Amino acid sequence: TIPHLAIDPFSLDFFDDPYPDQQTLRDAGPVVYLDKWNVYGVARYAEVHAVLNDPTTFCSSRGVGLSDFKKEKPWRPPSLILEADPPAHTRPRAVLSKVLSPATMKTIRDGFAAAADAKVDELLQRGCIDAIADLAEAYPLSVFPDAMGLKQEGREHLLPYAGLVFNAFGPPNELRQTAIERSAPHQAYVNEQCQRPNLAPGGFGACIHAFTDTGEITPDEAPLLVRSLLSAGLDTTVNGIGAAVYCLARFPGELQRLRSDPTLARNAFEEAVRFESPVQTFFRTTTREVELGGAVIGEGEKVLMFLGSANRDPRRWSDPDLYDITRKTSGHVGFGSGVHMCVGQLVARLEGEVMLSALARKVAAIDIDGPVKRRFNNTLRGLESLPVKLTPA
Ligand code: HEM
Ligand SMILES: O=C(O)c1ccc(-c2cccnc2)cc1
Ligand SMILES: [Cl-]
Numbered sequence: 001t002i003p004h005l006a007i008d009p010f011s012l013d014f015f016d017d018p019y020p021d022q023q024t025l026r027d028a029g030p031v032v033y034l035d036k037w038n039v040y041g042v043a044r045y046a047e048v049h050a051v052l053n054d055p056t057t058f059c060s061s062r063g064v065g066l067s068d069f070k071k072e073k074p075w076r077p078p079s080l081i082l083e084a085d086p087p088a089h090t091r092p093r094a095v096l097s098k099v100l101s102p103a104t105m106k107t108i109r110d111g112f113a114a115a116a117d118a119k120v121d122e123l124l125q126r127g128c129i130d131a132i133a134d135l136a137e138a139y140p141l142s143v144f145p146d147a148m149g150l151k152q153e154g155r156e157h158l159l160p161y162a163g164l165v166f167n168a169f170g171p172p173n174e175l176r177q178t179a180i181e182r183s184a185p186h187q188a189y190v191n192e193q194c195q196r197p198n199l200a201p202g203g204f205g206a207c208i209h210a211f212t213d214t215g216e217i218t219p220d221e222a223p224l225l226v227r228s229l230l231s232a233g234l235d236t237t238v239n240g241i242g243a244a245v246y247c248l249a250r251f252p253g254e255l256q257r258l259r260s261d262p263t264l265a266r267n268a269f270e271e272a273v274r275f276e277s278p279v280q281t282f283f284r285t286t287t288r289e290v291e292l293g294g295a296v297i298g299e300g301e302k303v304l305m306f307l308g309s310a311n312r313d314p315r316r317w318s319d320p321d322l323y324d325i326t327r328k329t330s331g332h333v334g335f336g337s338g339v340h341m342c343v344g345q346l347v348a349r350l351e352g353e354v355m356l357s358a359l360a361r362k363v364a365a366i367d368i369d370g371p372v373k374r375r376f377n378n379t380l381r382g383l384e385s386l387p388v389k390l391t392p393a
Contacts, residue, residue: 002295003028008036009281009304010170015376018280019321022309030293037066037171039283039302040295043309045316045333047293051284051305052337058284058303060340061085065169065283066302075168075180076187079231080217080224086339091216092225096343099207105346108147109354115143116354120362124392128369131249131386136242139355144234144347148226149203154189161186162235163377169282170378190230194223204229233344236279237351239382243276244269244356247323249366249388254325255359259393262360268325269352274332275323277308280381282336307333308381365391 005028007021008014014021025032025043032041042048051058061084063069069078078084080092119139123129137159145155164186167179192198196219199205205226212219248255248268258264286301297303310333312320335342342348359366370387 002031002033002040004033004035005041006035009034009041009306010037010173010175010378012376015381016374018308018381019312022306022312025306026309026313026315029295031295031297034304037302037304039066039304040297041304041306042292043306043313044293045310045313048305048307048310048333049337050292051303052333052340055085055339057287057290059085059287060089060284062285063283066171066304068285068300068302070285070300075183077224079228080221081228081343082232082340089339092221093339093343095208095211095216096225096228098211099204100344100347102346104204104207105350108143109350112143112147112350113354113357115139116351116358117362120355120358120390124362124390128387128389131245131366131388132238132242132375132383133385135245135355136238136382136386139241140234140237140351143351144237147204147347148229148233149200149205150193151198151200154193157186157189158230158234159238161190162231165231166235166377166379168378173378175376175378190227191223193230194226196222199226204233229344233347235380236344237348239276239278239380240269240273240348240352241355242382242386243278244272244352245359245366245388246383246386247272247275248356248359249368249386251323252365254323255363255366258325258356258360259364262357264325265356265360266349266353267327267329268356269349270329270332271323271325271327272352273334273348274311274327274329276381277311277334278381279334279379280308281306281379307336362393363390364393365389367391 022043025041030044030047034041042051063083164179164183167176170176196209208225209222211217212222258268282305284303286297286299288299290297314320335345367389369389373385375382375384
């Protein structure tokens with residue numbers, strides 16, 4: 001009934017060009033079995049959406065990586081939000097929602113936009129830059145650690161820690177095992193910055209600790225929720241902004257449309273999230289026997305959701321492989337769907353919008369002018385190096 005495939009979706013060959021293998025996974029059937037790792041897979045939009053939206057059957061508290069927390073010890077104490085199910089999930093989620101709220105966005109927007117305009121002006125003075133290190137990484141580094149309230153010393157640990165977190169959702173391949181081998185100094189730094197005295201007043205970290213007296217979370221929960229933001233909030237935006245710039249570099253017609261109407265910036269970023277799907281994959285674990293797209297999956301089974309494949313499924317999308325900045329993107333699953341849908345999506349969209357607005361207003365052309373190098377990670381899709389010449393408007 002269920003087709004068995006030997007595709008390794010965590011192999012470097014797959015990361016280097018996932019699209020043929022993703023079509024193979026979709027067209028093999030609504031549910032496949034991946035013999036390489038002994039997990040079920042779903043790569044069509046319909047089944048990915050269905051799994052995301054049934055958290056009771058497809059739970060998160062046994063881990064959203066390959067490892068089953070019921071069988072192995074997690075590599076660090078479990079997340080109180082990403083790796084929790086309702087009802088334990090509900091109040092931590094409510095707190096991060098209020099911390100990363102519309103009102104917080106209103107407080108930080110003008111500074112985030114100024115930093116974006118400043119970065120693009122700086123990059124235009126150089127002309128030839130690396131859109132990864134010099135833009136996708138430098139811009140989030142210039143705003144997010146400060147918005148968290150982190151001290152200056154030690155910020156060089158943040159991207160390495162994120163790379164570790166995202167590799168650790170994967171199977172025990174060399175990417176994962178190498179990351180864990182090198183983890184100890186990054187864990188030590190991060191865990192220390194999560195304590196209330198180390199988080200500057202008014203930042204996201206202090207706000208989490210401020211919410212510990214409402215009955216939603218206790219003081220001893222606040223450090224691990226700060227940990228959630230220090231795990232998630234930087235490398236995601238690096239690869240979302242990188243995705244958008246790479247799209248604009250490859251599709252000059254869409255850069256030209258964005259220049260002519262800079263208010264398309266927010267949707268241009270959203271389409272880049274659909275088109276590249278920088279967060280590629282998450283797992284769930286079945287809590288019972290279940291029928292999904294005609295197949296029967298037993299209890300205690302890992303299910304791998306291919307978010308990026310779902311976002312290119314022609315059963316759901318017209319011209320899925322076209323970057324279209326005026327596409328109706330609502331319903332894409334690049335930020336998830338349902339009770340765990342990205343609680344940081346307003347930060348992500350703010351950063352992406354203000355960066356693409358700065359490009360739309362200041363840049364006439366983005367031309368790749370050097371070798372493109374991909375960055376390999378078990379969960380994140382994105383580039384290591386993207387050499388571009390920026391032409392000023
Ligand atoms: C382009 C950028 C981003 C993308 C594509 C993205 C993608 C996602 C996805 C797919 C999920 C669902 C996980 C699941 O269902 O198991 C998620 C959840 C989450 N994201 Fe993001 N994310 C981004 C940015 C951010 C940022 C900037 C932050 C923090 C400031 C953040 C914090 C979180 C948290 C805390 C969760 C867990 C929510 C929950 O379990 O209820 N994310 N994200
Ligand atoms: O440590 C955590 O709780 C945590 C770690 C990573 C994420 C995450 C992953 C992908 C996109 N957005 C957020 C979320 C939460
Ligand atoms: Cl840690």
